[PDB]
Amino acid sequence: YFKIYSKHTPINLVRDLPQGFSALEPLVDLPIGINITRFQTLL
Amino acid sequence: FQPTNGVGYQPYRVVVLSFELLHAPATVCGPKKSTNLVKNKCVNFNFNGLTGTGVLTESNKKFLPFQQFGRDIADTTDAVRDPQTLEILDITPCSFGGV
Ligand SMILES: *[C@@H]1O[C@H](CO)[C@@H](O)[C@H](O)[C@H]1NC(C)=O
């Protein structure tokens, strides 16, 4: 089961992750049963 | 598998049912007929198999779009979401005390 949590927030910073605290809430739980060991991003 | 094989060697068809509660809505349910909801009264409630006894009242809690039921420090259900109505209900244990 592939659980996907997420969180969106406005920011004003061009360097790196802003420092602070915020929690990510679950949004999806896919019953895939697909074994995973690698991933990649697409822009 | 020959038809003359001993019953210990004869073919047997096997089906295994496994039940699963996920971090997702419960979509498999039994045929038990549902009933109307009663509030501000002591009742024996069964919400999607979450069974108990108490008084159901309108809550001011804020469940997230996914949350189905709350809990208390005792690990007892403190509130729930009605499967048929997107509302949150507080469970107060039925009044009791020494006599
Ligand atoms: C079934 O429950 C949903 C709750 O989201 C409600 O919107 C809908 O009207 C209900 N249907 C019937 C036939 O009661």
PDB file of C-alpha atoms and ligand atoms in Angstrom:
ATOM      1  CA  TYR A   1       0.000   0.000   0.000  1.00  0.00           C
ATOM      2  CA  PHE A   2       1.539   3.242  -1.245  1.00  0.00           C
ATOM      3  CA  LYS A   3       0.688   5.997   1.228  1.00  0.00           C
ATOM      4  CA  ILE A   4       1.102   9.568  -0.008  1.00  0.00           C
ATOM      5  CA  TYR A   5       0.999  12.514   2.400  1.00  0.00           C
ATOM      6  CA  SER A   6       1.440  16.087   1.235  1.00  0.00           C
ATOM      7  CA  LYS A   7       1.385  19.743   2.240  1.00  0.00           C
ATOM      8  CA  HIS A   8       1.385  23.011   0.274  1.00  0.00           C
ATOM      9  CA  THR A   9       2.485  26.341   1.701  1.00  0.00           C
ATOM     10  CA  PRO A  10       3.426  29.772   0.325  1.00  0.00           C
ATOM     11  CA  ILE A  11       7.074  30.738   0.731  1.00  0.00           C
ATOM     12  CA  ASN A  12       9.447  33.607   0.000  1.00  0.00           C
ATOM     13  CA  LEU A  13      12.917  32.063  -0.230  1.00  0.00           C
ATOM     14  CA  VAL A  14      15.302  31.158  -3.054  1.00  0.00           C
ATOM     15  CA  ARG A  15      18.008  29.324  -1.083  1.00  0.00           C
ATOM     16  CA  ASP A  16      16.749  26.111   0.529  1.00  0.00           C
ATOM     17  CA  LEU A  17      14.057  24.660   2.773  1.00  0.00           C
ATOM     18  CA  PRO A  18      12.574  27.330   5.065  1.00  0.00           C
ATOM     19  CA  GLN A  19      13.147  26.596   8.733  1.00  0.00           C
ATOM     20  CA  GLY A  20      10.057  25.936  10.809  1.00  0.00           C
ATOM     21  CA  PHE A  21       7.485  23.235  11.412  1.00  0.00           C
ATOM     22  CA  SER A  22       4.437  22.011   9.512  1.00  0.00           C
ATOM     23  CA  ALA A  23       2.755  18.614   9.293  1.00  0.00           C
ATOM     24  CA  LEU A  24       1.892  16.724   6.118  1.00  0.00           C
ATOM     25  CA  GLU A  25      -1.564  15.209   5.984  1.00  0.00           C
ATOM     26  CA  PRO A  26      -2.338  11.951   4.158  1.00  0.00           C
ATOM     27  CA  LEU A  27      -4.024  12.341   0.793  1.00  0.00           C
ATOM     28  CA  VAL A  28      -3.760   8.981  -0.995  1.00  0.00           C
ATOM     29  CA  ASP A  29      -3.395   5.275  -0.232  1.00  0.00           C
ATOM     30  CA  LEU A  30      -3.009   3.240  -3.418  1.00  0.00           C
ATOM     31  CA  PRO A  31      -3.439  -0.567  -3.055  1.00  0.00           C
ATOM     32  CA  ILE A  32      -0.768  -1.286  -5.642  1.00  0.00           C
ATOM     33  CA  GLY A  33       1.163  -4.259  -4.274  1.00  0.00           C
ATOM     34  CA  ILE A  34       3.927  -3.083  -6.612  1.00  0.00           C
ATOM     35  CA  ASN A  35       7.355  -3.505  -5.025  1.00  0.00           C
ATOM     36  CA  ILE A  36       9.454  -0.329  -5.212  1.00  0.00           C
ATOM     37  CA  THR A  37      13.167   0.296  -4.701  1.00  0.00           C
ATOM     38  CA  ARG A  38      13.822   3.389  -6.861  1.00  0.00           C
ATOM     39  CA  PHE A  39      12.012   6.489  -8.075  1.00  0.00           C
ATOM     40  CA  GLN A  40      12.549   9.670 -10.078  1.00  0.00           C
ATOM     41  CA  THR A  41      11.064  13.119 -10.666  1.00  0.00           C
ATOM     42  CA  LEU A  42       9.600  14.686 -13.807  1.00  0.00           C
ATOM     43  CA  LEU A  43       9.617  18.421 -14.523  1.00  0.00           C
TER      44      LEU A  43
ATOM     45  CA  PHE B   1      -5.039 -35.897  -9.917  1.00  0.00           C
ATOM     46  CA  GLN B   2      -6.938 -38.995 -11.001  1.00  0.00           C
ATOM     47  CA  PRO B   3     -10.570 -39.548  -9.941  1.00  0.00           C
ATOM     48  CA  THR B   4      -9.494 -42.808  -8.264  1.00  0.00           C
ATOM     49  CA  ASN B   5      -6.907 -41.060  -6.073  1.00  0.00           C
ATOM     50  CA  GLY B   6      -7.359 -41.325  -2.334  1.00  0.00           C
ATOM     51  CA  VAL B   7      -9.218 -38.421  -0.765  1.00  0.00           C
ATOM     52  CA  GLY B   8      -5.917 -37.323   0.759  1.00  0.00           C
ATOM     53  CA  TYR B   9      -4.541 -37.054  -2.788  1.00  0.00           C
ATOM     54  CA  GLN B  10      -7.713 -35.749  -4.446  1.00  0.00           C
ATOM     55  CA  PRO B  11      -7.854 -32.100  -5.546  1.00  0.00           C
ATOM     56  CA  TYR B  12      -9.308 -29.519  -3.174  1.00  0.00           C
ATOM     57  CA  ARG B  13     -10.169 -25.936  -4.099  1.00  0.00           C
ATOM     58  CA  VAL B  14      -9.156 -23.400  -1.449  1.00  0.00           C
ATOM     59  CA  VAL B  15     -10.179 -19.764  -0.934  1.00  0.00           C
ATOM     60  CA  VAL B  16      -8.705 -17.531   1.783  1.00  0.00           C
ATOM     61  CA  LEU B  17     -10.531 -14.347   2.784  1.00  0.00           C
ATOM     62  CA  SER B  18      -8.354 -11.682   4.405  1.00  0.00           C
ATOM     63  CA  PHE B  19      -9.941  -8.525   5.810  1.00  0.00           C
ATOM     64  CA  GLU B  20      -8.232  -5.146   5.699  1.00  0.00           C
ATOM     65  CA  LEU B  21      -8.708  -1.752   7.310  1.00  0.00           C
ATOM     66  CA  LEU B  22      -6.502   0.800   5.540  1.00  0.00           C
ATOM     67  CA  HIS B  23      -5.741   4.492   5.837  1.00  0.00           C
ATOM     68  CA  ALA B  24      -8.638   4.922   3.423  1.00  0.00           C
ATOM     69  CA  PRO B  25     -12.449   4.767   3.429  1.00  0.00           C
ATOM     70  CA  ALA B  26     -14.114   1.475   4.329  1.00  0.00           C
ATOM     71  CA  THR B  27     -15.937   0.314   1.197  1.00  0.00           C
ATOM     72  CA  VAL B  28     -16.623  -3.391   1.881  1.00  0.00           C
ATOM     73  CA  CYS B  29     -19.630  -3.742   4.181  1.00  0.00           C
ATOM     74  CA  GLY B  30     -22.075  -6.395   5.304  1.00  0.00           C
ATOM     75  CA  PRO B  31     -25.745  -6.699   4.397  1.00  0.00           C
ATOM     76  CA  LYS B  32     -26.949  -5.547   7.828  1.00  0.00           C
ATOM     77  CA  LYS B  33     -29.741  -3.039   7.324  1.00  0.00           C
ATOM     78  CA  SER B  34     -28.927   0.491   8.445  1.00  0.00           C
ATOM     79  CA  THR B  35     -31.147   2.564  10.729  1.00  0.00           C
ATOM     80  CA  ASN B  36     -31.943   6.191  11.429  1.00  0.00           C
ATOM     81  CA  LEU B  37     -29.820   8.080  13.941  1.00  0.00           C
ATOM     82  CA  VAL B  38     -30.937   9.145  17.421  1.00  0.00           C
ATOM     83  CA  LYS B  39     -29.185  11.898  19.370  1.00  0.00           C
ATOM     84  CA  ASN B  40     -29.011  12.974  23.009  1.00  0.00           C
ATOM     85  CA  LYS B  41     -30.054   9.501  24.167  1.00  0.00           C
ATOM     86  CA  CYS B  42     -28.304   6.392  25.486  1.00  0.00           C
ATOM     87  CA  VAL B  43     -28.052   3.837  22.684  1.00  0.00           C
ATOM     88  CA  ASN B  44     -26.049   0.849  21.496  1.00  0.00           C
ATOM     89  CA  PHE B  45     -24.299   2.149  18.386  1.00  0.00           C
ATOM     90  CA  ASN B  46     -22.511   0.378  15.533  1.00  0.00           C
ATOM     91  CA  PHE B  47     -20.700   2.700  13.096  1.00  0.00           C
ATOM     92  CA  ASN B  48     -19.163   0.585  10.314  1.00  0.00           C
ATOM     93  CA  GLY B  49     -18.465  -2.149  12.868  1.00  0.00           C
ATOM     94  CA  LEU B  50     -17.190   0.251  15.536  1.00  0.00           C
ATOM     95  CA  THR B  51     -19.499  -0.872  18.332  1.00  0.00           C
ATOM     96  CA  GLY B  52     -20.217   0.691  21.686  1.00  0.00           C
ATOM     97  CA  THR B  53     -22.753   2.278  23.999  1.00  0.00           C
ATOM     98  CA  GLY B  54     -23.293   5.922  24.819  1.00  0.00           C
ATOM     99  CA  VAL B  55     -24.911   9.233  23.945  1.00  0.00           C
ATOM    100  CA  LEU B  56     -24.349  10.729  20.492  1.00  0.00           C
ATOM    101  CA  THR B  57     -24.264  14.533  20.371  1.00  0.00           C
ATOM    102  CA  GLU B  58     -23.364  17.172  17.812  1.00  0.00           C
ATOM    103  CA  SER B  59     -19.622  17.767  17.975  1.00  0.00           C
ATOM    104  CA  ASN B  60     -17.527  20.897  17.535  1.00  0.00           C
ATOM    105  CA  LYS B  61     -14.436  18.860  16.634  1.00  0.00           C
ATOM    106  CA  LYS B  62     -12.619  19.308  13.372  1.00  0.00           C
ATOM    107  CA  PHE B  63     -11.874  15.986  11.699  1.00  0.00           C
ATOM    108  CA  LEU B  64      -9.758  16.148   8.595  1.00  0.00           C
ATOM    109  CA  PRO B  65     -11.364  15.081   5.297  1.00  0.00           C
ATOM    110  CA  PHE B  66     -10.016  11.567   5.890  1.00  0.00           C
ATOM    111  CA  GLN B  67     -10.435  11.065   9.644  1.00  0.00           C
ATOM    112  CA  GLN B  68     -13.218   8.604  10.477  1.00  0.00           C
ATOM    113  CA  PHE B  69     -13.152   8.421  14.287  1.00  0.00           C
ATOM    114  CA  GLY B  70     -11.350  10.029  17.200  1.00  0.00           C
ATOM    115  CA  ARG B  71      -9.945   8.522  20.377  1.00  0.00           C
ATOM    116  CA  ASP B  72      -9.311   9.406  24.010  1.00  0.00           C
ATOM    117  CA  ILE B  73      -6.260   8.940  26.215  1.00  0.00           C
ATOM    118  CA  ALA B  74      -7.835   5.640  27.288  1.00  0.00           C
ATOM    119  CA  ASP B  75      -7.847   4.458  23.642  1.00  0.00           C
ATOM    120  CA  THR B  76     -11.654   4.627  23.645  1.00  0.00           C
ATOM    121  CA  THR B  77     -13.575   6.186  20.787  1.00  0.00           C
ATOM    122  CA  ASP B  78     -14.421   9.779  21.703  1.00  0.00           C
ATOM    123  CA  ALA B  79     -16.183  10.784  18.465  1.00  0.00           C
ATOM    124  CA  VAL B  80     -16.994   9.424  15.012  1.00  0.00           C
ATOM    125  CA  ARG B  81     -18.045  10.436  11.498  1.00  0.00           C
ATOM    126  CA  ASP B  82     -21.411   9.148  10.325  1.00  0.00           C
ATOM    127  CA  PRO B  83     -20.828   7.021   7.190  1.00  0.00           C
ATOM    128  CA  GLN B  84     -24.080   8.281   5.646  1.00  0.00           C
ATOM    129  CA  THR B  85     -23.766  11.924   6.760  1.00  0.00           C
ATOM    130  CA  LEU B  86     -20.533  13.930   6.721  1.00  0.00           C
ATOM    131  CA  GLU B  87     -20.917  15.086  10.312  1.00  0.00           C
ATOM    132  CA  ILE B  88     -18.833  14.522  13.436  1.00  0.00           C
ATOM    133  CA  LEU B  89     -20.562  13.217  16.561  1.00  0.00           C
ATOM    134  CA  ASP B  90     -19.254  13.189  20.119  1.00  0.00           C
ATOM    135  CA  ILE B  91     -19.784  10.044  22.187  1.00  0.00           C
ATOM    136  CA  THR B  92     -20.411  10.693  25.866  1.00  0.00           C
ATOM    137  CA  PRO B  93     -20.486   7.555  28.047  1.00  0.00           C
ATOM    138  CA  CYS B  94     -23.888   6.918  29.562  1.00  0.00           C
ATOM    139  CA  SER B  95     -24.322   8.582  32.936  1.00  0.00           C
ATOM    140  CA  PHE B  96     -23.371   6.322  35.819  1.00  0.00           C
ATOM    141  CA  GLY B  97     -22.392   6.482  39.452  1.00  0.00           C
ATOM    142  CA  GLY B  98     -22.248   4.834  42.842  1.00  0.00           C
ATOM    143  CA  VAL B  99     -25.513   4.051  44.603  1.00  0.00           C
TER     144      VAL B  99
HETATM  145  C1  LIG C   1     -26.091   8.353   0.660  1.00  0.00           C
HETATM  146  O1  LIG C   1     -25.194   9.026   1.548  1.00  0.00           O
HETATM  147  C2  LIG C   1     -24.645  10.229   0.988  1.00  0.00           C
HETATM  148  C3  LIG C   1     -23.662  10.773   1.997  1.00  0.00           C
HETATM  149  O2  LIG C   1     -22.571  11.424   1.360  1.00  0.00           O
HETATM  150  C4  LIG C   1     -25.763  11.218   0.656  1.00  0.00           C
HETATM  151  O3  LIG C   1     -25.200  12.350   0.005  1.00  0.00           O
HETATM  152  C5  LIG C   1     -26.803  10.568  -0.247  1.00  0.00           C
HETATM  153  O4  LIG C   1     -27.912  11.444  -0.418  1.00  0.00           O
HETATM  154  C6  LIG C   1     -27.282   9.253   0.358  1.00  0.00           C
HETATM  155  N1  LIG C   1     -28.223   8.591  -0.530  1.00  0.00           N
HETATM  156  C7  LIG C   1     -29.443   8.204  -0.145  1.00  0.00           C
HETATM  157  C8  LIG C   1     -30.280   7.532  -1.192  1.00  0.00           C
HETATM  158  O5  LIG C   1     -29.853   8.387   0.998  1.00  0.00           O
END
